[PDB]
Structure formats: C-alpha cells, structure tokens
C-alpha cells in the first residue's frame, strides 16, 4: 500500500504534463519523417518515454501485475482528449499512427486508432449506403419520372468534393481499394440483384444513374491497383448488360466479357431483366454449359 | 271700649253675626277702641267662616256719631240673652273682660304677632291669616282678604311665603303651617323644597318657579340656593337627568352673584369627569361655556375663545373633560408631541378638505406636529392627498420616515406584483424621495420582486414567496434560480432569462459578483441548468450546454456536472440500452473532461470512458438495433 | 277625620283651660265652625249628587255636634239662671 501510494500520484505528474502540452501544438503542423504531423506529436514522445522513466522509482517485480492495466489505461486517457483539441480526425488519425511507429509498445493506442478509423469509414459507408438504395429506391417508385436529385446534389458532390478528398488525406492505397470495392460490390450491385424484377424501363433509369456513379468513383492515382480497374471495368460491363437486346448478350460471354460475371450471376442477370422464353433458355443453358465444358 | 259693649261684642263675634259686628265696628270713635275690637275679632271670629264676612273692616269708617251707650242699649233690647252677660256687678264684668282680654292677647303672642295702631289693618290681616291657618292648614285661606288689600307688604308676603308654602304642601302632601314655615331657617325651607319624589328637569323647573325663586326673592338672599341645592354634592354629573338639571339651573338668569359662577364652575371642575360615563358632549360644553360671558377670571387664565378652540379637538385627543384638557398644558414636551401627533393623525383620517387643515392651523413644535400629520397620511395610504399637500405646502418628509414606511408596506405585501395594494403603496412611498439615485436599490428590489411574481416560486414547501423573503436569499441568490428551474419547466432552456434574473438579484440585494462579467456565477448557473435538464430527460440540451461549460476557464470546478452528462442513462431508452449515437457523445464529453478534471478523479472518469468504448465495440454498426 | 280630630282636640283643650260665659263662647264658636262644615257637605252633595259628603259629615261630626249642643244649652241656661237670680236680688 506504499507502492500503490506512489503509482497513482506519478500518474498525476504525467497527466499534468499532458494537460500542459501547450494548446497551440494541436493546431500547428510540423514537418517530420514524408508525413507531416502536428507540433505536439514530437513533444508527445516525451510523456510515454517519461512513463517508462517514472517506473524506475521501484521498477517491475514490485509493479509487474498492474503495469498492463496502468499502461493501457494511460494510453486510453491520452487518446480521448486530443480528438477534441485536434479538429480534423484525419489530421488526428495520421498523428496517432506516427506515434506508435516511433515506440511500438503503445498497443492499446493503435487499437483505439484503428477502430477510430473503422468508424470513420463506416460513417462514410453509412451515408453512402443510404443515398444509393434511396436513389435506387427513388428510381423504383417512379420508373417513368425518376427524381435524379438523390444522385445530383448529395451523393456525387459528397464523393468528389467531400467523401473522396477526405480519403486522400489519409494516404493508404490498400484501404481506398477496400472502400471502392465496398460501393461497387456490396452496395450498388447487390441491391440491384435483389429487386423482384428490374423493370425493362427501370434498367435505363438505372443505366443513367450508375454511370454517373463511375464518374464520381474514378481515382486516377489507382489505375495501377488490380481490383480498382476490375471494379470499373465490371461496372462498365454492368451498364452495358442493362440496355441491350438478347442477341448482344451471348456474344459477350463467348468473348470472355463475362470474365467478371459468375455463371450464377450471368444467369441471374438474365433471370431478372427479361421474360421467360426458350430464347432466354438457349442462351442461359449455353452460358452455363460453355462454362461447363471449359 | 265700654266693658259691657266689649262683652256683648264678643258674643256677636263668636256667633259670626256680620250685621251686629259691622254696626259695632262703624260705631267705634277712637283708634284705641278699634285696636281692642280688631284684636277681639281676630281671635274670636269663627275660623271656618267665609273671609269675605269680615271684609267690612277694610271699608272706610263712616263716623255715624252713634254713641257706644246707644248701640249697647239697642243690642240688649234685641237680644235678651246679653242681659245676663252685661248687667252683672262691676267686679263680675271686670273679671269677664280681663279673662277674655288675657285669652285674646295670649293667643296673639302665641303667633308672635303684635297688632300695631300704625298698621292696624295690615297686622290684623296677617294675625287673622295665622289664626285661621293654625286650624285649616290652607296657606291661601285668607286670599280673598289679601286680594282686597293695597299693602305692598301683604302682596310680597302672599307671593314670597303663602304661594310657595301652598305649592310645597300640595306637592309633598305636607300640612306645614304658615307660622311653622316662617320660623324655619332659609336653608331648612330650601331643603324642604329640594325634597323631590323624582329629580327630572320638569319637576325642578316647577319647584324653582313656584317655590324657591319667589321665596329667595322675599328673603332677599340667594345664598341658601347655592348652599343647599346648587352644590357639588347634589350635582355628581353621573346621569343624564342630573346633568340636564345642572344645565337648566346653570342657565337661570337670577342670581347675578359671583358665588353662583364659582359654584357652577366648582360643580363642573370637580364632577365633570363623570360626564365621560348626551348626543354631542362638545356642543353641550360649548353651549355652557358660551353662557358664562367673556369673563377670563373664572377660567384659570384661559380665554372663552381659547376654551372654544380647545373644545373642537377634545374628540381628536380622546379627552372628555375640561380638567384633563387643562392638565395637557402641564404635561412634558414628549407627551405634548405625542398628543399633538395623535390629534393631527385623527383629524386627517378619511377624506379631508383644506378647511380641516386650516382648523388645525387656527388651533396652533409645528415641525413635529406637521411630521406626525404627514406620518398619519402615509400610515393610512392617503397618497393622493399627501402628494397634493407636499406640492402645495413645500413641506418635505424626512427620507428616514419615507424608507421606514416603504419597508412597512413592502413587508406586508402578499405577493410581488405591482398590482398588489401594498406593493403599489411601497412604490408610491419611494416616489416621495427627493433623491432617487441614493436609494436606487429599493427600486431594483421592487422590480425583481414583480418579475419573480410572474413565475411559480415558493419560499418553503407549501409557503408562497412574499416580497419580504427576498432578503433571506442575500447570502445565496442562486437558490432563487434553482427553485425557478424546478417549478417553471419553460425556464430550463432559457439560460439568458435566468442569467438576467440572477444579475438583477445581485443588483437588488447589493451582492458583489466574482467579476464584472459574472464569470463564476454564469458557470454555476450553467451547471444548475445541466443538472436540471438531466433530471428531466433532456440529454440533447444538457449535452449542448455541457460543451459550453467545458470550454469555460473555471470548468474544472464543475467537473461533477460534466461527468453526470458522460454517465447519463435514460430509463425510457429502448431495452434500457444507451443509443449508439449517445455513446459517441458521452465518450465525446468524458475525454474532454479528462483534460480538465482534478487528477484524483482520473480513474473514475477513465472507467466510464472505457465502459462506453467496450459497449460501442459490441454493437453491429451495420444493423444497429440501438441507433 | 283629621279635621274632626283636630276640632275635637282643640275643643276639649280649650274647655279644660277654665262663670259659664267662657264655655258658652267656646261652644258657640265650635257650633258655628260645625255649621260651616255642614254647609260645605250639603253644597258638595248638590254639586255632585253621588258624593258621600253628608254621610261622611254625619259619621265624623254627629257626636261632636251633640256634645256642643248639650254644652251650649247647659251654659246658656246657667247664664240665664244667674241673671234671673241677680234681678230678683236687685228687686
């Protein structure tokens, strides 16, 4: 109870120093390695060096059992505050990965940070998830007179002047691949597959829409990533499926143009858009069978 | 007279023989014979015979020149019974004459009357009246003989003795003889007259007019009236009848003696205290005092006019007697000041005109009397008349008296509204102040108490807030705002209005704020709003205000209220689970709080943060049931 | 009754003070007084025929009238006898 006596009180000396990191350091940016962090990040190195420093006054053995409790808790405490002092959470996220680069002992700190990001991605996903089905829902209720507004004032401006420019600030091209993949695969196309039917007229409406989607999901820096081009090619192929009479459709399959379509998906796309005939039949068994022979 | 004629005459006299007795009387040649005959007639004539039958003695004597011997001769001729009486031996005749003359003289001496030769008829009528009255007890038994007399002495005796005695005897059913009444002292005679079966003004008036006034006028002295009747022992002034008899006797124009006015005053001055135990006492005293005339010597150095002036204020002084009024002159200056202040306060009650004030001026330190007058108008809420009087007279009320009456009205007021009669009177009272700036705080107090009356406010549970209670909150004006937030749900979101009320309370109560901007008071006020909003389920507005509180320089003093937002749980949330959005907000405020809270609280604040972060990590943010 | 008693008292007093001449005068004076009271009682009964004044008179004065009449007659007779005896002595 002597050892407990000092451990909570030096917890106080670092916390006073954290409140003491001068306020103007959370708003100014310093150049450091190339990434740019805020002026406080480098001062920040001292606090967690200083926690190891404060341990010398009775070390481990006398401290081993709560250190992880006490270490993780301190990492958690610092993390929460700087979100309210560092306005731009993306500016915020970059600082935090840089700190746990400098000293790879800040385990909880990365968990907090990676989850902080997961959140911000989901925020971007949720807002975008809402618009697309809704425009698609909008298309759904008035085939004849769609309100193209859903796309026009909020979704694309979001992407071009809001969603996407935000994502540039975070700089990690593996992740953007995860986001673009999300919209194309899990959002847009899947809802489209699950309508009861995609009216003959709805498809062209839908055709005007998605293409508008391609226009806002083009990230030139990524022409170099494989699935980025495969998503954009595929979507390019999806609009084309949507506005053709049956004969052009078999022609594509054979051309490998169904490279990005499962036979399951190829037939399902056949099943949703056009009425039952042998014509749909000869073509469907042909694709599953040529797919069978290969 | 001839001895034989004297004996014969006595027989005719005792028989009531008017003819023979008148003929003998007209035959008498000398005044000595007439005197001897009138003595015999006075005693020996039958007392019950008509007084008119002896009226022949009042007629002038016709000297018919009949000799006594010729008359004696005719009488003995006509009545043979006289022979045995008149024709005896000389010694028998002398014995008869001497026995009869002794009886006649002894009878007259028994009445203390001597018939004088110079006044023979007057003394005969008086003697005969006493002889007859000794038998009949009628004091007017000789009225027919007296009415035929031209003697002023007999008329004065009739008016002064006989008529008073006849009225007294008829009134009391007494049979007092003239001789007994004339031998009473003047005091005893007046004492017999003052025996009244009932003491009423009508009875006393009849006795005065028909007994006492004629008797005292005949005696030539009114001294028996003041000694026996008109004294303090007979006039205790303890009944309306005794007082009205005193007023009636005090107005009699006889007697013009200084002793009357002294005795009248001694009755009023000794017994006038009993008058306090009449339709209008002041008017009765005024009428009595006016009846003395303007003789200042009677009044112990106060003029008639000064008494009449002083009488007008007796009701205002609660003084009911002249002796207590004179005693006020001997009282000290403090007692005199108190009485004069009561006079002015009583005279100025109700609706008054300028003449009411002029009457007090005619009666008239004047400054102290005027102060008591103004205090009485203030006391009675006569503000319209007070404002009119102050504007016309130029008299100023002392600011101390104004402030005393302000607090009197303010402390009685039932509520703070300027519609309340006592709040109106308190406000009117402050408008009399010559310098409003020196007492600005009293107007600030009226203003804030009116503002507070528009809200639901209670001093204690079940006790209404009165204006007077505002002074109890001087040590903590925030407690009024705390009670306002609890009782008025519309104020919970209106921080500007409650901050304005708090600034007005500090101004009115002369409480010094922490700084010019009320920085600490506003932080505390914001803390009380957040606490009240959380207690009422309004997490949104509590959160918005806790973001304003956390950015304040003194936010560390209020860390508990900020922490309460970070741990808030609404029992009406779905499944009693914190909505996911609210978890982000609570994390939101708890780690801003980690930068400002006391270092000793870091563990508790971090534990709430980690509990919310763990809960958030369990949620499927894609299919969030608690969104 | 008071008047009858006062007349009776005065009469017997005056008779007791002391020649038949004195008692003759006292009885004659009382006879004249009683005659005046009689005349008054008769007048009252004439002015009001319902008055008992005559009966009151007879009740109160009859014995006194009888006594006075007897004494007056006795003394008048003694006066005459003394005179007749004197006249015979002179003859």
mmCIF file of C-alpha atoms in Angstrom, chain B residues 242-439:
data_model
loop_
_atom_site.group_PDB
_atom_site.id
_atom_site.type_symbol
_atom_site.label_atom_id
_atom_site.label_comp_id
_atom_site.label_asym_id
_atom_site.label_seq_id
_atom_site.Cartn_x
_atom_site.Cartn_y
_atom_site.Cartn_z
ATOM 1 C CA UNK B 242 -78.541 65.214 36.884
ATOM 2 C CA UNK B 243 -76.543 66.839 34.026
ATOM 3 C CA UNK B 244 -79.709 68.307 32.406
ATOM 4 C CA UNK B 245 -80.866 69.732 35.795
ATOM 5 C CA UNK B 246 -77.335 71.196 36.225
ATOM 6 C CA UNK B 247 -77.559 72.743 32.673
ATOM 7 C CA UNK B 248 -81.041 74.168 33.455
ATOM 8 C CA UNK B 249 -80.006 75.688 36.839
ATOM 9 C CA UNK B 250 -76.695 76.960 35.290
ATOM 10 C CA UNK B 251 -78.835 78.917 32.758
ATOM 11 C CA UNK B 252 -81.083 80.673 35.332
ATOM 12 C CA UNK B 253 -80.604 84.479 34.942
ATOM 13 C CA UNK B 254 -81.097 85.128 38.618
ATOM 14 C CA UNK B 255 -78.851 85.285 40.734
ATOM 15 C CA UNK B 256 -76.159 87.734 39.429
ATOM 16 C CA UNK B 257 -73.746 86.788 42.257
ATOM 17 C CA UNK B 258 -70.037 85.833 41.724
ATOM 18 C CA UNK B 259 -70.730 82.933 44.178
ATOM 19 C CA UNK B 260 -73.141 81.444 41.562
ATOM 20 C CA UNK B 261 -70.464 81.326 38.847
ATOM 21 C CA UNK B 262 -67.841 79.976 41.312
ATOM 22 C CA UNK B 263 -70.261 77.227 42.445
ATOM 23 C CA UNK B 264 -71.238 76.444 38.795
ATOM 24 C CA UNK B 265 -67.508 76.067 37.972
ATOM 25 C CA UNK B 266 -66.755 74.028 41.133
ATOM 26 C CA UNK B 267 -69.542 71.539 40.175
ATOM 27 C CA UNK B 268 -68.210 71.205 36.570
ATOM 28 C CA UNK B 269 -64.494 71.081 37.562
ATOM 29 C CA UNK B 270 -64.980 68.573 40.454
ATOM 30 C CA UNK B 271 -67.579 66.270 38.857
ATOM 31 C CA UNK B 272 -67.097 66.833 35.055
ATOM 32 C CA UNK B 273 -65.082 63.540 34.882
ATOM 33 C CA UNK B 274 -68.402 61.678 35.356
ATOM 34 C CA UNK B 275 -69.711 63.216 32.062
ATOM 35 C CA UNK B 276 -67.427 60.697 30.265
ATOM 36 C CA UNK B 277 -69.572 57.842 31.748
ATOM 37 C CA UNK B 278 -75.523 63.211 25.541
ATOM 38 C CA UNK B 279 -75.943 63.394 21.696
ATOM 39 C CA UNK B 280 -72.857 65.657 21.387
ATOM 40 C CA UNK B 281 -70.738 66.349 24.512
ATOM 41 C CA UNK B 282 -68.591 69.013 22.738
ATOM 42 C CA UNK B 283 -71.699 71.006 21.674
ATOM 43 C CA UNK B 284 -73.177 70.819 25.227
ATOM 44 C CA UNK B 285 -69.866 72.061 26.736
ATOM 45 C CA UNK B 286 -69.624 74.781 24.009
ATOM 46 C CA UNK B 287 -73.189 75.997 24.795
ATOM 47 C CA UNK B 288 -72.481 76.010 28.566
ATOM 48 C CA UNK B 289 -69.103 77.801 28.245
ATOM 49 C CA UNK B 290 -70.675 80.473 25.925
ATOM 50 C CA UNK B 291 -73.270 81.159 28.701
ATOM 51 C CA UNK B 292 -70.632 82.482 31.178
ATOM 52 C CA UNK B 293 -69.927 85.516 29.003
ATOM 53 C CA UNK B 294 -66.394 86.708 28.286
ATOM 54 C CA UNK B 295 -65.033 86.876 31.854
ATOM 55 C CA UNK B 296 -61.499 85.441 31.718
ATOM 56 C CA UNK B 297 -61.055 85.462 35.543
ATOM 57 C CA UNK B 298 -63.345 82.430 36.012
ATOM 58 C CA UNK B 299 -61.329 80.244 33.616
ATOM 59 C CA UNK B 300 -57.926 79.877 35.382
ATOM 60 C CA UNK B 301 -56.170 82.081 32.766
ATOM 61 C CA UNK B 302 -57.688 80.516 29.581
ATOM 62 C CA UNK B 303 -59.930 82.823 27.497
ATOM 63 C CA UNK B 304 -63.509 81.878 26.494
ATOM 64 C CA UNK B 305 -62.325 81.773 22.843
ATOM 65 C CA UNK B 306 -59.323 79.534 23.669
ATOM 66 C CA UNK B 307 -61.662 77.115 25.528
ATOM 67 C CA UNK B 308 -63.982 77.096 22.459
ATOM 68 C CA UNK B 309 -60.963 76.360 20.168
ATOM 69 C CA UNK B 310 -59.722 73.591 22.527
ATOM 70 C CA UNK B 311 -63.233 72.003 22.727
ATOM 71 C CA UNK B 312 -63.146 71.390 18.897
ATOM 72 C CA UNK B 313 -60.164 68.993 19.404
ATOM 73 C CA UNK B 314 -61.415 67.077 22.510
ATOM 74 C CA UNK B 315 -62.649 64.176 20.317
ATOM 75 C CA UNK B 316 -59.306 64.075 18.391
ATOM 76 C CA UNK B 317 -57.354 63.990 21.727
ATOM 77 C CA UNK B 318 -59.715 61.360 23.266
ATOM 78 C CA UNK B 319 -60.165 63.913 26.117
ATOM 79 C CA UNK B 320 -63.701 64.076 27.609
ATOM 80 C CA UNK B 321 -63.336 66.727 30.356
ATOM 81 C CA UNK B 322 -62.082 70.326 30.808
ATOM 82 C CA UNK B 323 -59.779 69.385 33.731
ATOM 83 C CA UNK B 324 -57.914 66.750 31.644
ATOM 84 C CA UNK B 325 -57.688 69.317 28.806
ATOM 85 C CA UNK B 326 -56.074 71.862 31.225
ATOM 86 C CA UNK B 327 -53.761 69.074 32.535
ATOM 87 C CA UNK B 328 -52.304 68.616 28.988
ATOM 88 C CA UNK B 329 -50.746 72.106 29.358
ATOM 89 C CA UNK B 330 -48.768 70.764 32.380
ATOM 90 C CA UNK B 331 -47.524 67.606 30.531
ATOM 91 C CA UNK B 332 -43.908 67.424 29.261
ATOM 92 C CA UNK B 333 -42.826 68.212 25.652
ATOM 93 C CA UNK B 334 -42.672 64.462 24.680
ATOM 94 C CA UNK B 335 -46.241 63.800 25.915
ATOM 95 C CA UNK B 336 -47.432 67.065 24.276
ATOM 96 C CA UNK B 337 -45.698 66.000 20.983
ATOM 97 C CA UNK B 338 -47.399 62.562 21.178
ATOM 98 C CA UNK B 339 -50.877 64.078 21.833
ATOM 99 C CA UNK B 340 -50.472 66.691 19.069
ATOM 100 C CA UNK B 341 -49.363 63.910 16.634
ATOM 101 C CA UNK B 342 -52.490 61.885 17.616
ATOM 102 C CA UNK B 343 -54.724 64.977 17.039
ATOM 103 C CA UNK B 344 -53.343 65.502 13.506
ATOM 104 C CA UNK B 345 -53.495 61.757 12.647
ATOM 105 C CA UNK B 346 -57.141 61.532 13.874
ATOM 106 C CA UNK B 347 -58.232 64.807 12.163
ATOM 107 C CA UNK B 348 -56.653 63.690 8.823
ATOM 108 C CA UNK B 349 -58.224 60.184 8.735
ATOM 109 C CA UNK B 350 -60.713 59.577 5.883
ATOM 110 C CA UNK B 351 -61.473 62.186 3.204
ATOM 111 C CA UNK B 352 -60.469 65.677 4.366
ATOM 112 C CA UNK B 353 -60.654 69.135 2.806
ATOM 113 C CA UNK B 354 -58.266 72.115 3.126
ATOM 114 C CA UNK B 355 -60.603 73.598 5.838
ATOM 115 C CA UNK B 356 -59.777 70.638 8.105
ATOM 116 C CA UNK B 357 -56.063 71.637 7.860
ATOM 117 C CA UNK B 358 -56.924 75.358 8.347
ATOM 118 C CA UNK B 359 -58.798 74.470 11.590
ATOM 119 C CA UNK B 360 -55.605 72.763 12.920
ATOM 120 C CA UNK B 361 -53.577 75.876 11.900
ATOM 121 C CA UNK B 362 -56.095 78.169 13.722
ATOM 122 C CA UNK B 363 -55.652 75.844 16.752
ATOM 123 C CA UNK B 364 -51.793 76.066 16.587
ATOM 124 C CA UNK B 365 -43.035 72.205 17.654
ATOM 125 C CA UNK B 366 -45.078 72.997 14.499
ATOM 126 C CA UNK B 367 -42.495 70.907 12.518
ATOM 127 C CA UNK B 368 -43.066 67.868 14.809
ATOM 128 C CA UNK B 369 -46.875 68.294 14.585
ATOM 129 C CA UNK B 370 -46.544 68.546 10.754
ATOM 130 C CA UNK B 371 -44.309 65.402 10.771
ATOM 131 C CA UNK B 372 -46.997 63.434 12.732
ATOM 132 C CA UNK B 373 -49.655 64.715 10.263
ATOM 133 C CA UNK B 374 -47.560 63.511 7.258
ATOM 134 C CA UNK B 375 -46.784 60.174 9.000
ATOM 135 C CA UNK B 376 -50.568 59.691 9.574
ATOM 136 C CA UNK B 377 -51.336 60.322 5.850
ATOM 137 C CA UNK B 378 -48.544 57.831 4.922
ATOM 138 C CA UNK B 379 -49.828 55.365 7.591
ATOM 139 C CA UNK B 380 -53.383 55.467 6.095
ATOM 140 C CA UNK B 381 -52.193 55.217 2.423
ATOM 141 C CA UNK B 382 -53.588 58.741 1.616
ATOM 142 C CA UNK B 383 -51.014 59.202 -1.185
ATOM 143 C CA UNK B 384 -53.179 61.427 -3.478
ATOM 144 C CA UNK B 385 -53.747 63.953 -0.639
ATOM 145 C CA UNK B 386 -50.133 63.611 0.548
ATOM 146 C CA UNK B 387 -48.816 64.389 -2.998
ATOM 147 C CA UNK B 388 -51.248 67.376 -3.213
ATOM 148 C CA UNK B 389 -50.275 68.693 0.264
ATOM 149 C CA UNK B 390 -46.470 68.308 -0.273
ATOM 150 C CA UNK B 391 -46.700 70.049 -3.698
ATOM 151 C CA UNK B 392 -48.718 72.995 -2.222
ATOM 152 C CA UNK B 393 -47.064 73.499 1.227
ATOM 153 C CA UNK B 394 -43.415 72.908 0.170
ATOM 154 C CA UNK B 395 -43.003 70.727 3.324
ATOM 155 C CA UNK B 396 -40.577 67.797 2.829
ATOM 156 C CA UNK B 397 -40.945 64.426 4.542
ATOM 157 C CA UNK B 398 -37.667 63.131 6.044
ATOM 158 C CA UNK B 399 -36.138 60.362 3.819
ATOM 159 C CA UNK B 400 -35.825 58.209 7.015
ATOM 160 C CA UNK B 401 -39.651 58.294 7.520
ATOM 161 C CA UNK B 402 -40.180 57.537 3.780
ATOM 162 C CA UNK B 403 -37.801 54.491 3.944
ATOM 163 C CA UNK B 404 -39.470 53.251 7.189
ATOM 164 C CA UNK B 405 -42.930 53.352 5.526
ATOM 165 C CA UNK B 406 -41.526 51.715 2.337
ATOM 166 C CA UNK B 407 -40.330 48.693 4.375
ATOM 167 C CA UNK B 408 -43.653 48.622 6.281
ATOM 168 C CA UNK B 409 -45.696 48.312 3.040
ATOM 169 C CA UNK B 410 -43.107 46.013 1.341
ATOM 170 C CA UNK B 411 -43.052 43.576 4.325
ATOM 171 C CA UNK B 412 -46.915 43.343 4.460
ATOM 172 C CA UNK B 413 -47.372 42.741 0.694
ATOM 173 C CA UNK B 414 -48.978 39.364 -0.090
ATOM 174 C CA UNK B 415 -47.094 38.871 -3.384
ATOM 175 C CA UNK B 416 -44.549 40.728 -5.543
ATOM 176 C CA UNK B 417 -46.908 42.003 -8.255
ATOM 177 C CA UNK B 418 -47.094 45.791 -8.754
ATOM 178 C CA UNK B 419 -50.868 45.094 -8.884
ATOM 179 C CA UNK B 420 -50.809 44.239 -5.095
ATOM 180 C CA UNK B 421 -52.136 47.199 -2.973
ATOM 181 C CA UNK B 422 -49.158 47.157 -0.560
ATOM 182 C CA UNK B 423 -46.632 46.908 -3.454
ATOM 183 C CA UNK B 424 -48.413 49.949 -5.007
ATOM 184 C CA UNK B 425 -48.171 51.764 -1.633
ATOM 185 C CA UNK B 426 -44.442 50.828 -1.330
ATOM 186 C CA UNK B 427 -43.806 52.135 -4.907
ATOM 187 C CA UNK B 428 -45.793 55.356 -4.198
ATOM 188 C CA UNK B 429 -43.764 55.782 -0.952
ATOM 189 C CA UNK B 430 -40.450 55.651 -2.923
ATOM 190 C CA UNK B 431 -41.779 58.303 -5.374
ATOM 191 C CA UNK B 432 -41.740 60.810 -2.432
ATOM 192 C CA UNK B 433 -37.904 60.512 -2.133
ATOM 193 C CA UNK B 434 -36.137 63.762 -3.063
ATOM 194 C CA UNK B 435 -33.062 61.852 -4.354
ATOM 195 C CA UNK B 436 -33.995 58.589 -6.160
ATOM 196 C CA UNK B 437 -30.332 57.759 -7.025
ATOM 197 C CA UNK B 438 -29.270 57.466 -3.331
ATOM 198 C CA UNK B 439 -31.849 54.660 -2.856
#
